[PDB]
Each structure stands twice: as structure tokens, then as C-alpha cells.
Amino acid sequence: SPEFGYWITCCPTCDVDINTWVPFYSTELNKPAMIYCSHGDGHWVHAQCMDLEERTLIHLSEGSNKYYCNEHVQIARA
Amino acid sequence: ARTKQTAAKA
Ligand SMILES: [Zn+2]
Ligand SMILES: [Zn+2]
């Protein structure tokens, strides 16, 4: 179910579907890795849908920076 | 940044 937050359509180009997904990152088991976007009220995106390389995803995860996804990072922030 | 499924676990 999408209610657990993984098997969702995360963005207009999202390719992830529970019937066809396969592991891609070294840290994945049976669920896609995701990252939190701070735009608006916030939302989660699949890392692979953002075209994040593993090293980049891990660097983001180990740091304290907020993240803005590819759809929202270019929107001016008041 | 907050992430999910980014660490090895046991
Ligand atoms: Zn996606
Ligand atoms: Zn976003």
C-alpha cells in the first residue's frame, strides 16, 4: 500500500512500481531509497527518480543540509 | 537530509 510511503508516484517522471522495481543502491533490500524535499509542506522522492548517484545520496544522508528536489529547487524561497 | 533505506542494518 502507498500509505507506508514507498510505493507512491513521487514526481511526474517517477518510474518506480512495486511490480517492476529492483534494488539499485547498495543499501536497498526490498524498498526504494528515498530522500525528503523541504518544499512547501514537504514530500518524499525516490532517490533514483532524482538521478542521484549513490555517493551523492549517501553524502546527503550523512549531512545536516535540507534537500530540495529537482521539481522544486529552482522555485524562489521567501 | 532525511533519507530512508540508506544504511546497512541488522
Ligand atoms: Zn519515484
Ligand atoms: Zn520537492
List of chain A residues whose C-beta atoms are within 8 Å of the C-beta of residue B10: none
Our CA-based measurement puts residue A6 at a distance from the nearest CA of chain B, in whole angstroms, of 9
Spatial distance between the Cα atoms of A45 and A61, rounded to a whole number of angstroms: 14
SS3 sequence of A44-67: EEECHHHCCCHHHHHHHHHCCCCC
Segment A15-23 long-range contacts (CB within 8 Å, at least 24 positions apart): A15/A48, A15/A49, A16/A46, A16/A48, A16/A49
Question: Which residues make Cβ contacts (< 8 Å) with residue A12, sequence separation at least 6?
Answer: A71
Going by CATH, does the domain composed of A32-64 fall within 3.30.160.290? yes
* Kind and range of the H or E run holding B3: strand B3-4
- The rounded Å distance from CA A33 to ligand 1 centre is 10
Residue A42 CB partners (closer than 8 Å, separation 6+): A36
| Cα–ligand 2 centroid distance for A42 (angstroms) | 7
* Among the listed residues A37, A28, A24, the one whose alpha carbon sits nearest the alpha carbon of residue B1: A37
- Residue in chain B lying closest to A63 (CA): B1
